[PDB]
C-alpha cells in the first residue's frame, strides 16, 4: 500500500549525514583544564520542500594531553544556505567563505564581524570559482596575508555583426565551441590560479602554467615563495574525469613571479592529493601507474623538498598483504593526515567488504590496522590534527555516528580509545551478514587462478516462513559495497524482503590481480559469478526460490540484462537505471571512449578507425544479443540529461521489448543528468521501484 | 572629499549591533564543574550587497552556583537567512523556527536533526504569520506538546462576473477595502490565535474571541487550560500602533474548549506586556492611565492567579523618586524579568540623559538601581534565568559589547559583578559630556515651574581653535537622547564637528511634569529651549559662533523649520527628513489624526467635525507662517510611501521656498516609507547630509 | 545533411581539387546513426535493407553501412573545414560532426566549429542563419 | 501542416479543428492536502 510505503520512506530519510569537520585552537583555563571545540557540516533531506538542506553543529572537548576527559554540546544547529566553499585560518583565529547569493562574494570573518567581502564578479579577472572536488581549492598564506583558489578563465567579448552602436569585441565569434571535461562538469573547460590579497583586495592570475594542462589542487609552498600544483593534461582533446584517476597528470612547483614551471615528478603516469607536512620538509601525494583501468590499486609516494628524492612508501599489494590490508584504493587523502611529529600519515580504505582506518610509517613502511577485528562497519576519517582524529561509524543497521580519539604513540596504535559525540538509534529489525564464495573450476583462467569473492546478506531479524529476494550488483565495474548505512537496502529489509548484495570479481579492495581479472570478459564471467552466488544462497538459506528480483545502474543494469536474457525462468522482475545496452552505438556517443575499448579487450588509442573486428566484438559482448529470449517485466528509468550513458540505450531496449508485447513500464526525468541525485527525483524513482517490486512480488 | 567621507562610512559602519540572547540547560561533569551555553544574535550592515545580514553565536560560561568561574568562546559566526521567529523549549531540549523560504513553514529542531517541518501555506486555514513586536509571538505549552502563535484571519473567496468556468466564490468582491493598522502595518486588519499539535499536526483557530478586539501577546495559562492575551480595540476604527502605548486595550483568557472570554482587568486604560512568573502563582505587566499622550510614564501592575486580586507595585513619579529613578518609560519587558524565587522583577528605563537596570520587589515596592554612579552610559537586558542576566553596555565612544553577571540576594543588589564576554576597541578621539539648563524665569508657566532639561556635547579631544557645531534635537516630541552609541553623531565628531544633542522639556525620563508640560504649547516652548541651549553653549564653550547648522527628522524637522524661521541670522544650513510643515492639512491625511489634535490643544473625539476656531489655532502653530523669512540653504529628505508623515508637507515648504530663489536641494526616495531604513537609501542621505554641511560650513 | 555527406565524400575521395568546405549537420557514420535518429528506415532503405520492426543488429548490415560512410575516408582529408552544428537536432544527431572534427583536429588540420545550443536541424531562427552565412561567406573568401 | 486544420460547416454553425489529447492529472506521493 502507497501510504505505509510512504511514511515508511519519510521515516528513514528523516537520517542526517556527515560531511565535513574542522579542529578549533587549543585554550587552557586559569584553573588548569584545557579543551578545545569541534566543528561538524551535516545534511539532510526535506521532502516538504524537497531539498537537501545543510547545518552547522559545533561540540566541546575537554582533554589532559593525552586522554579525554569531557566531551558535550554545544548549542543548537544553524542552517546555512550559499556557502560554497570554507576555510580556517592556520592559527583559527579568521573564516574564509566562498557565498553564492547572483554573484559570487569572498567574505573574511574574524570574531563576531565580517571584516572583509570582496565582490568577485564585478573585478571581472575570470569566470565563475570551481567549487567542486576534482579542481576546486581555497589555501591561506603562512603569513595569513594572501589567499589562492582557482576560477574559470575569462573568454573574449564577441558581438554580432548585425548589432546597432551608439551614435573591442570579436565579431561573429560568439557561438564558437569551447570543450568540458565531461559529466556533472558542465561549461568548465580551462581553470586558472588566481591569488587575491586581503590588505589592498588587487586579484592576479598567476602566469607561467604550460598552456596545455588544467592546474588544480594547489597549495602554497614553503616560505610562500611558489604554488604547488597538479597539472591534467587537456591535448588533444579532454576525457571524463569524474570516478577516473586514469587521466594523465604531473606534479608542478611556479614561483609567484613570472617564471618557468618546474615539474616535481614523472610525466607518464597519473598522481594526484599531494599533501605538505606540518614541519614544512616533504610532500606525500598519490601514484597510479597504469591508465587501463579507470579505477585500481595505488601507491604512496614521498618526496623531499631539500634533497629533491622521491622514494615509494606504501607500493602495489597482488593480492593481500598480511591479513588486514589489501592496498589503497581511495582517491583522495583527508585535508589533515599527518601525525604531529611529521613521521606517520593516518588514511582509510576498504578491506574485503568493509572499510578500515590504517597508519603509515613512512620510515620505515609498516602498516598498521586501527579498527582491525570485530564483527565489521564503514570508518571514514575527517581530519587530524595534533594527533587528534576525528572520525565517522555506520553499519547497514546503524545510521552514522560522530566519534573523536587520541592516536596512541609509535608501534602502539592498535590501543586507541574512542569516546562518542553524537549516537544514532540503531534499528533491531535488520540482520546484516558477510558470505564467500569460491567460483567452480570451469569459471577460472590460468592466469589468476584461485580468487574468490564475497556478498552482503541482509535478512529480517525474528522471522516466523519462505521470503522473497532481491539481488543487487554494483555498478564500476571496479567498486565495491561496503558494511555501511545504506537506505534503500533497509527499506527493502524492513518492508519483508532479504537483500543480496554481491561484490564480483574485479572490484576494489581484493587486489590488483581482481582488478586486472575482469578486462576483456565481461558478458559471461562477472554474469557467471552472479549466477553462482544466487543458485549457492538460495541452495543454503532456504528462501523462497518462486520469487527473486533484480535491481541495478548502470554497468549493474547492464548485468542485470544480461541476466534476464540468459536465465529467463529464474527471475520475477527487474528494475533498472540508465542501463549500458549496446557497446558499439555507446562508444561514439559517451564522454568516456576508452571505457568501451578497454573494456571490450583492445587498447584506446587517439585517432582510432572503426574496425570490423572491433564492432563485431563489442556487438558479441552486448544484452541486446538476448532480447528475443527476456520474459520478466522490466522496469526502466531514464536521465534525458544524462552524458556519461546517452538515454538511447535505454530505448532500443524498450522499443524491442514492446514490440514483441512484454510487460514493460519506462519513466523519463528531462532534467536529471546521470545520478538522479534531486530530492524529487530519487524519491519518486524509489517509490516507484519499491511497489513495482511489491506489486510483482 | 568625497573618498574620505566614503572610507570613513565604511569604517564606522563596520560594527556590529546585538539583537537578542538565549541560555541554555546546565550541565553537570563528572570531575564536578558546572557551565551553561549562551546563545546571542548580531546583525551588521553589508555595503558590497546592500543588505542586513544577521549571524547567531555561541559562549560558554564555567560557574559556581553565584559566582562565574570561567567565560570564553565556543566556535565561529554563522550566518542565517529566512528566519522570522525562534523560541527555544522550557526543557532546553528542543527549537522552533519560523521560515520564509515563497511560503512559510514551521520547523522544530532536536539535537542534530529537524525533528518535524510543517507547511502552513498549504493547510490553508489563516493567513501570513505576524512577525513584528506589536502582535507576533511563539508560545510552547508547558507540556511540550503544543505551540501557540497568531496569524491573519482568512478571508472568503472572491471572483469576477465575467469569469469562464470549465466545461464557492463571492461575484464582485474581490476589491473591498480591508482596513489594516497604520504606519509598518500594511496589509495587517485582524490577527487570529492558532494553536498547532506537534503530534498529529492539526492546527486550530481558537473560537471566544470578542469580535471586535485584535489579540495579541499570547502565552498559555498555568496547567495548560486556556490562554492569556491582549486584546486592542479596533471599533469604530483603527489608528496607529507603532510607537503608540495611548491605545485602548485589555488582558483576557480564554479556555482551550469553546466558550466565553473573561476580562482581567479594566477596560478603559491602556495595559501591555504581560509576563508570568516561574512558579506559575502570579502576572505582572504595564498599565498605561491615560490615552491624551502618545508615550508616558507607566505603572506596574501584579495580578494573583488563585486570590483573583490587583495591586499596584510601582505607581506613577511625577518628577523624581530619591536621586536614582525617574519612573518606567519602557514599552516592553524582557521575556524573562523574574528571578528565581519568584519575588523580584528586573528591568531597564531611561533615567535623566542615561540608561540603567533597575530590580524591584513586588513585595515591598523598593526600586533599587544597579548601575548607579559612574560617568555614564547605556544599559540593556536581553535575559534572566535562574539568577544570570546577559547585559548590553554601549557609550557614545564605546560600540557594543555583552557581559553577563549573577543577580546577588536581597538587599545586596549594587554589589553586581560582571565579566565581559565580546569587548570592543573604543575612539579615544571622542570626548562626550553632560549639561544641564535652567529656562529663564520668562520662559515658564506656573502650572509646573522649576523644570530643567540638558543636552549632551561631543567634541573631538585634542583640539590645536574655533570649531563649526551641528544642533539636532530629537523626535517625539515625547523622546530621547541616551548617552549610547550612535553612528551619524560618531562620524559627524570625527569628521571635525561638535555635536549637540538637545532634550528639551517634554522629553522621557524627567517625570510625568516634564511629559504634560508640552502639550498645547508647540510651536513656542521648545523652540526657545533649543535657542536658549544654543546661546548657553555658545557662550560658555567659546566655539566658532560663525558656522552653526541644524538637523532634525519628523518633529526634529518641524523645530528645525520653526528655528530657521524666527532666527533667521544664526544658522548657515539645514538638513530635514520628512518634517511636519503644515498641521492643519496634515490632519485629513495622518493615520494618527489624534496626534494633531492633543499637540494643538484640544481633545480628540470620534466623529469630529472641522471647526473655524481648531483650524485657526492649528495655523498658528505651523511652521509655514515664518517661509517669507527663511534665508538658510535647505536640503530636503523625503520618503515617498510614508503613512505617518504624507510626503506633500515637504512638497509645499519647497514650493514656497524656490518661489523665492532661495538655495534648496531636494531628494525623493520612491519607496523608503518613513524611517528610510534600506541601507542604500541611508548611506546615501547620510552621505548627502555631511557633504551638504561639509560643503556649506 | 546529405549534402554534408557527399562533400565528405568529395573532400576524401579526391583530396586535390577543392580547397575549401563548408558544412551544416552533416551525416558521417550511418551505423552509429541508426540508433539515434526518429527515422530509423532511412538508414536501412539507403544502404541497400528492407525495414522490419524488431530488427537486430546483423554483422552483415553493420559492415556494408561502414562500408558507405565518409568517415572511412577521414585519414586523407587535407582541405580546410567549417562546421556547423545544432545541439537540438532530432533528425540528425549532433555527435556525427564531433566525430569528423575529433578525427580531423588529431591530425592537425585547419578546422573551425560552431555549435548552437538551441537551433533543431535548419537553423531557421534569424540570428543563428545570419551568422551562420556570415561565418560560410567569410571563410570562403578568405580561403579563395 | 500535417496534421492542423480549420473547417466551417455548410450550414455556417459549426467549427473543425485538431487538438491534443487530454492527459489524466497526476501528482506526487509527499504532496500536501489542505486541513
Known amino acids: ?177 569551447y570543450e568540458d571535461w565531461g559529466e556533472n562538469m558542465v561549461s568548465k573547460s580551462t581553470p586558472v590560479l588566481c591569488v587575491l590579497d586581503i590588505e589592498s583586495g588587487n586579484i592576479s592570475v598567476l602566469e607561467g602554467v604550460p598552456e596545455s594542462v588544467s592546474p588544480g589542487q594547489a597549495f602554497w609552498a614553503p616560505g610562500d615563495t611558489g604554488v604547488v600544483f597538479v597539472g591534467w593534461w587537456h591535448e588533444p582533446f579532454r576525457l571524463g574525469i569524474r570516478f577516473c584517476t586514469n587521466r594523465r597528470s604531473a606534479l608542478y612547483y611556479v614561483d609567484l613571479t613570472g617564471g618557468k614551471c618546474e615539474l616535481l615528478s614523472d610525466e607518464s603516469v597519473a598522481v594526484t592529493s599531494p599533501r605538505l607536512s606540518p614541519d614544512q620538509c616533504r610532500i606525500v601525494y598519490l601514484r597510479f601507474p597504469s591508465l587501463v583501468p579507470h579505477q585500481q590499486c595505488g601507491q604512496l609516494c614521498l618526496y623531499d623538498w ?52 590504517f597508519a603509515v610509517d613512512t620510515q620505515m613502511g609498516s602498516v598498521t590496522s586501527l579498527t582491525a577485528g570485530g564483527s565489521g562497519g564503514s570508518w571514514k576519517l575527517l581530519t587530524i590534527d595534533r594527533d587528534l582524529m576525528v572520525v565517522q561509524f ?187 545496452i549496446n557497446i558499439a552505438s555507446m562508444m561514439g556517443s559517451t564522454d568516456i571512449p576508452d571505457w568501451c575499448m578497454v573494456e571490450a579487450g583492445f587498447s584506446y588509442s587517439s585517432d582510432c578507425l572503426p574496425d570490423l573486428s572491433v564492432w563485431a566484438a563489442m556487438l558479441d559482448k552486448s544484452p541486446i544479443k538476448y532480447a528475443p529470449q527476456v520474459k520478466t517485466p522490466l522496469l526502466l528509468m531514464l536521465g534525458q540529461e544524462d552524458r556519461r550513458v546517452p538515454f538511447k540505450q535505454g530505448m532500443e531496449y524498450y522499443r524491442v521489448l514492446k514490440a514483441r508485447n512484454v510487460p514493460v513500464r519506462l519513466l523519463l526525468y528531462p532534467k536529471s543528468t546521470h545520478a538522479l541525485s534531486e530530492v524529487e527525483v530519487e524519491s519518486d524513482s524509489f517509490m516507484n521501484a519499491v511497489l513495482w517490486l511489491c506489486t510483482h512480488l
Open 306 to 357: 631539500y634533497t629533491r628524492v622521491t622514494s615509494v612508501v606504501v607500493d602495489i599489494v597482488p593480492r593481500q598483504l598480511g591479513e588486514d590490508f589489501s592496498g589503497i584504493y581511495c582517491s583522495l587523502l583527508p585535508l589533515g593526515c599527518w601525525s604531529a611529529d611529521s613521521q606517520r600519515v593516518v588514511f582509510d580504505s576498504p578491506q574485503r567488504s568493509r572499510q578500515d582506518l
Open 1 to 177: 500500500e502507497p501510504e505505509e510505503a510512504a511514511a515508511l520512506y519519510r521515516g528513514l530519510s528523516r537520517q542526517p549525514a556527515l560531511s565535513a569537520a574542522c579542529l578549533g585552537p587549543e585554550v587552557t583555563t586559569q584553573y588548569g583544564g584545557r579543551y578545545r571545540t569541534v566543528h561538524t557540516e551535516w545534511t539532510q533531506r526535506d521532502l516538504e520542500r524537497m531539498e537537501n538542506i545543510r547545518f552547522c553543529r559545533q561540540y566541546l572537548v575537554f582533554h589532559d594531553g593525552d586522554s579525554v576527559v569531557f566531551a558535550g554540546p554545544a548549542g543548537n544547529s544553524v542552517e546555512t544556505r550559499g556557502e560554497l566553499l570554507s576555510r580556517e585560518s592556520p592559527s583559527g583565529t579568521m573564516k574564509a567563505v566562498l557565498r553564492k547569493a547572483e554573484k559570487q562574494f569572498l567574505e573574511v570573518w574574524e570574531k563576531n564581524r565580517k571584516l572583509k567581502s570582496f565582490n568577485l564578479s564585478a573585478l571581472e579577472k575570470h569566470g565563475p570559482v570551481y567549487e567542486d572536488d576534482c579542481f576546486g581549492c581555497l589555501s591561506w598564506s603562512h603569513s595569513e596575508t594572501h589567499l589562492l583558489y582557482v576560477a574559470d578563465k575569462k573568454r573574449p567579448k564577441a558581438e554580432s555583426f548585425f548589432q546597432t552602436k551608439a551614435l573591442q569585441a570579436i565579431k561573429g565569434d560568439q557561438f564558437l565551441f
Open 394 to 580: 555506520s553499519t547497514p543497521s546503524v545510521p552514522p555516528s560522530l566519534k573523536v580519539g587520541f592516536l596512541p604513540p609509535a608501534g602502539k596504535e592498535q590501543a586507541v580509545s574512542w569516546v562518542s559525540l553524537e549516537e544514532a538509534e540503531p534499528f533491531p529489525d535488520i540482520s546484516w551478514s558477510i558470505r564467500v564464495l569460491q567460483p567452480p573450476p570451469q569459471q577460472e583462467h590460468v592466469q589468476y587462478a584461485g580468487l574468490d569473492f564475497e556478498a552482503i546478506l541482509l535478512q529480517p531479524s525474528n522471522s516466523p516462513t519462505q521470503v522473497p529476494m532481491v539481488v543487487m550488483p554494483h555498478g564500476g565495474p571496479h567498486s565495491s559495497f561496503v558494511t555501511a548505512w545504506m537506505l534503500f537496502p533497509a527499506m527493502l529489509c524492513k518492508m519483508g524482503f532479504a537483500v543480496l548484495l554481491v561484490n564480483y570479481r574485479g572490484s576494489t579492495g581484493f587486489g590488483q590481480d581482481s582488478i586486472l581479472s575482469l578486462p576483456g570478459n565481461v558478458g559471461h564471467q562477472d554474469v557467471k559469478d552472479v549466477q553462482f552466488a544466487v543458485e549457492q544462497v538460495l541452495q543454503e538459506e532456504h528462501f523462497d526460490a518462486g520469487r527473486v528480483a533484480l535491481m541495478g545502474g548502470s554497468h549493474g543494469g547492464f548485468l542485470s540484462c544480461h541476466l534476464i536474457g540468459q536465465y529467463p525462468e529464474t527471475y520475477s522482475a527487474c528494475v533498472v537505471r540508465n542501463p549500458v
